[PDB]
Design a protein around this nucleic acid. Structure first.
Ligand SMILES: [Zn+2]
Ligand SMILES: [Zn+2]
Ligand SMILES: [Zn+2]
Lengths: 98, 80, 60, 94, 109, 150, 97, 79, 60, 109, 94
DNA sequence: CTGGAGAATCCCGGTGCCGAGGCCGCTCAATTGGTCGTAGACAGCTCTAGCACCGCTTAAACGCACGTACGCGCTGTCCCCCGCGTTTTAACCGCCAAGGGGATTACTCCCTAGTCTCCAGGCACGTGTCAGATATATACATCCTGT
DNA sequence: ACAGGATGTATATATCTGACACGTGCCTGGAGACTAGGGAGTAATCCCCTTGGCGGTTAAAACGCGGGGGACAGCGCGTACGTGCGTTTAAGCGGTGCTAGAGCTGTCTACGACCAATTGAGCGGCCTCGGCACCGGGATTCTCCAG
């Protein structure tokens, strides 16, 4: 007999796991490729320090985690547990980013 | 280097959401997460490149990135 | 068809060279001034009311 | 009998330059003065802070250029840079 | 007895005071030395921004059939323009009020 | 044929071929259509008479919405031209209109040749010589005219 | 007699107060409130009338912005009546709590 | 004392109306007159510290403007 | 002839569908939108200034 | 052969350098003149803040049963104390993580 | 072969004074250095702004105390000004 | 609601390493001691404005009653998200190579600080006149209930 | 949906009025000319680290499938909030009076910038070992499903 957890238990387990660790969650090489692509629009043939790319990645992950906390608060306020783009838009509008 | 925004994968976004304490995630979240991240990176990188080209060098430095972040009211520690 | 589209729908003889400021239909000159001098501030298209400051010349 | 400085005269000349037949309230002039002082403070502080980053002791037109690019968004920045460059070229030529 | 004095603002084709800007820069304790073209550039930028806001405010005042610009007109001009709104996003204008808008949900139907 | 600016330049070229204004001509650079070489004749009734002025003009893809960069190639003596040939005109910096074409630009330049703008003294020496001494100013203009033939 | 259904006078009031620019709080109670709050920092301070006016301008602007944000929250919650939960959510999102 | 009640129910209602609120629940007046006094305390404390650094006994509009500017709430029209 | 007559004169690419109520000249709408949002709030033809309310959609 | 040099930090009974603070104030282009007690006061304040954060981080590390302080411990110490959290509310700590907390609604019951 | 200055030594001494038997990582030291630089910049800027406001040309201990009161909240500010006053008094007595 | 199976979590032990910690030049930055110009402390005069009070109007806050529209609870459904196994992809680590560009040092020269003189732009002070607010009698659009 | 009554609402006219735009004396700060020195522009050189490439492992991503839980629509009830009207109440305005303190001026002294000489403490480098991450194995625990 196969064993399956109820939907949500492993979700809570992995929330506990990722709220305890501190490693970077985005894959470094694709993040670097994305950074170079975006920077291509301002100055061609730019060179980047590895420390600079790491600083960018750290800042983005912190920003996205904060945004997701705000989104979760909005979703809970809407009396539901699933986050939808209207919640992200509400959070960004209240914070003054849109 | 075209169409690299898809490197920010669905499982990575879910891991970020879990660190944010999110239990269930709608299927449409990923696209505007990509969009928000893209907007944030353009905003930061524009200022970083401005600092770099004012310094008259072709290399973007972590110091320039820190300066750009501080200019947006989100100072970052641990990089000088 | 170009002449028909360029001609006013009131008389179908003369070029459309003026518009009514609040309702934005395009008509002739003497067609609208005759309507106004006859006191009929009245659109043949959308029936809207108008005054002395509600119309002006327009050139192609 | 203290002498206090403001930008009222210059704002008034600019207003009559743009809208030749439009006035301005006394309270609006105060807001324009506050706005001018605020933008001046922003740009000067950013330029000084840049000069400090680059281990420089002189604020020249380049720092003002870069500070405008950093502060003003998009098309405003583009036009402001264009105006500043034109003014500097005109001043140097004359 | 030396020569006819010409103001730097007139020399640069500007209405804002170049000399006053230079004095404020040197007295404001921003840097040890101040370049020659820095006050010219700063005065030009300030003049351009002032002209932009005044032009929009004059348009707004004309749209209300008034010939004098008031803080309400300034507020309307700033908040209706996206770039000026972004530049002055954390600025409160006294006696300026707010922009008239109502969410579509609240409207009757 | 790819871009609207390129197509606009194509009509500019064909109009300059079929009905050019008096004393003006132009052509693309062979390897770069964005580069425009133009020859302007000095207006009649002016000190610039007999002049054959070489011009270079550089466009981008956002033409006609923006005034291009226009530069004199031969040495020029005009109150409104910088020593390098930089050109400061109303339609070229302040009141550009997309309806304007290269023919209109050349005609406006020729108009400036007769009527220098005192509000843009790009060459201070030339402005001063025009302002208080027309005789030696036009002597200098004749010098640049005879110099432009080479 | 004549009777307006609820929501119409409210819409008229929204249109009216979004068009005018006067101070929406009575001056003397606000002045007394400011003096009362300031007295716990130092005794018998004095205030300029312009200072009190500046405080009132700032307070009304802040409250109006907060009410726009709380209206957005209430609409997001599929409601039209704002509630203190909405204010708390807006305050928490803006990082004031 | 007890001056917080000066911020009356109709005053709060018309502030909400300017903000764009259709209807207001009855528990909001107490919440908002607490929010207001928190904001006022934060601003007034900075204003008073400015004043006492200046060795003055009267709070000035310029001190209030500085206190607001210290919180990212720059105010135009008072100096 | 007719094509150029009824095509927007500044771009010469598409059709006239807008009027500038200050100078009452007719251009195509997106040229106008672009000159506004790029902040050249100036008439291409008669060099007149205009605001957000001086231009509107027209149908010819 | 004047006298044995006593550091100003030792005179003030502080571990932080007073001379370095004075040099940074004079070089930092904050004012043309700097008082004598200003570097002393600034050094004392910096020392007190550093001591507070270090004590909290050490307590956090001892809670986790480690003997070294890492950015995770620094982040925990900062985010747990309300005063420090307010002071550093707009600060990102590299390799800091987040406070482990889950909203009560999400928990099953 | 440029030399760069930091507060690593003093931070380590303070750590040894507080927790005599606790270590600190290299990366944590970087965070402490950034924190010290940040607080220094904040207090220095606030003190300079006070000096400019009062038309004063000298940054004394009074401006530093006022800036500390403005920045630090509540009980933290009370303790900070207490330590500052104690240190300046000891320095003047020495 | 009460028990077993299973998967996940916690605890203990050995081990290897590389990063924290102590030690040694030495060089530059901190210290010490005069010197002097001036910025700031301080006394004194003033007269501006903040505080206090009183009386009258009336605009606004207050309180009550009603009804109805919205908040909230309950229920059904179905579809969209989650848990999981398998396969595919490319991230990642390790190593190697070329060189572009960042990081120094020397030299000089031109640009900006500092000073003295002067004169004209801008500031305080008056003043009349027109933009705008107010009161009033309209024409007209908008809501509400009965049809 | 339609129409007429009632109520805000837009409109044109006349009139006060007080704030603004213009004019004037004057005064002090910006312009002009000059001198001096050092900030930085330029060139040259060194070597660091950044980019690019290749290959093997394998961890993570992608896909698919089954199921079930939660988002959403719908319905009913009750209560609380908007609306209107009658009754306080005190905000607001004016007028007057008092004096505390902001603000300015003039004196004078301690104090911070500047300089030159001295030395010791922090930086760079360079060992060295133990705190900790990791791999193995045993004990404990949470959750699910059958009972
Ligand atoms: Zn007709
Ligand atoms: Zn067009
Ligand atoms: Zn026109």
């Amino acid at each position: 007999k196969p064993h399956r957890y109820r939907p949500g238990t492993v979700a809570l387990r992995e929330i506990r796991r990722y709220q305890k660790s501190t490693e970077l969650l985005i894959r470094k090489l694709p993040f670097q490729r994305l950074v170079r692509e975006i920077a291509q629009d301002f100055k061609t043939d730019l060179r980047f320090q590895s420390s600079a790319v790491m600083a960018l990645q750290e800042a983005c992950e912190a920003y996205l985690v904060g945004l997701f906390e705000d989104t979760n608060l909005c979703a809970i306020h809407a009396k539901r547990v699933t986050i939808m783009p209207k919640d992200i838009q509400l959070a960004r509008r209240i914070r003054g980013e849109r | 280097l075209r169409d690299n925004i898809q490197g920010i994968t669905k499982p990575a976004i879910r891991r970020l959401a879990r660190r944010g304490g999110v239990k269930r995630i709608s299927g449409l979240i990923y696209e505007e997460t990509r969009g928000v991240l893209k907007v944030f990176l353009e905003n930061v990188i524009r200022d970083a490149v401005t600092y770099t080209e004012h310094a008259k060098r072709k290399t973007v430095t972590a110091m320039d990135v820190v300066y750009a972040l501080k200019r947006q009211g989100r100072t970052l520690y641990g990089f000088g | 068809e170009y002449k028909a589209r360029l001609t006013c729908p009131c008389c179908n003889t003369r070029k459309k060279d003026a518009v009514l400021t609040k309702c934005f239909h395009v008509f002739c000159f003497e067609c609208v001034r005759g309507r106004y001098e006859a006191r009929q501030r009245k659109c043949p298209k959308c029936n809207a009311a108008f005054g002395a400051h509600d119309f002006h010349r327009i050139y192609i | 009998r203290s002498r206090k400085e403001s930008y009222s005269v210059y704002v008034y000349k600019v207003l009559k330059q743009v809208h030749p037949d439009t006035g301005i309230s006394s309270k609006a002039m105060g807001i324009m003065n506050s706005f001018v002082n605020d933008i001046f403070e922003r740009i000067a502080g950013e330029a000084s802070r840049l000069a400090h980053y680059n281990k420089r002791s002189t604020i020249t037109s380049r720092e003002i250029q870069t500070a405008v690019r950093l502060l003003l968004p998009g098309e405003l920045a583009k036009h402001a840079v264009s105006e500043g460059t034109k003014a500097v070229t005109c001043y140097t030529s004359a | 007895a030396r020569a006819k004095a010409k103001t730097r603002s007139s020399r640069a084709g500007l209405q804002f005071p170049v000399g006053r800007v230079h004095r404020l820069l040197r007295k404001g304790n921003y840097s040890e030395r101040v370049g020659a073209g820095a006050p010219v550039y700063l005065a030009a930028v300030l003049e351009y921004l002032t002209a932009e806001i005044l032009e929009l405010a004059g348009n707004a005042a004309r749209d209300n059939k008034k010939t004098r610009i008031i803080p309400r007109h300034l507020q309307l001009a700033i908040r209706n323009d996206e770039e000026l709104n972004k530049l002055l996003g954390r600025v409160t204008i006294a006696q300026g009020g707010v922009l008239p808008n109502i969410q579509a949900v609240l409207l009757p139907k | 044929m790819s871009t609207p600016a390129r197509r606009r330049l194509m009509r500019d070229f064909k109009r300059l071929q079929e009905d050019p204004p008096a004393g003006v001509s132009g052509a693309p650079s062979e390897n770069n259509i964005m580069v425009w070489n133009a020859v302007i004749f000095g207006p009649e009734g002016t000190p610039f008479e007999d002049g054959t002025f070489k011009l270079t003009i550089e466009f981008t893809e956002e033409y006609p919405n923006k005034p291009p960069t226009v530069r004199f190639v031969s040495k020029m003596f005009h109150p409104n031209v910088y020593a390098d040939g930089s050109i400061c005109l109303d339609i070229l910096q302040n009141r550009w209109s997309p309806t304007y074409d290269v023919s209109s630009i050349l005609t406006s330049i020729q108009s400036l040749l007769d009527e220098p703008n005192p509000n843009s003294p790009a060459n201070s020496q030339a402005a001063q010589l025009y302002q208080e001494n027309k005789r030696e100013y036009e002597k200098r203009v004749s010098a640049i005219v005879e110099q432009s033939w080479r």
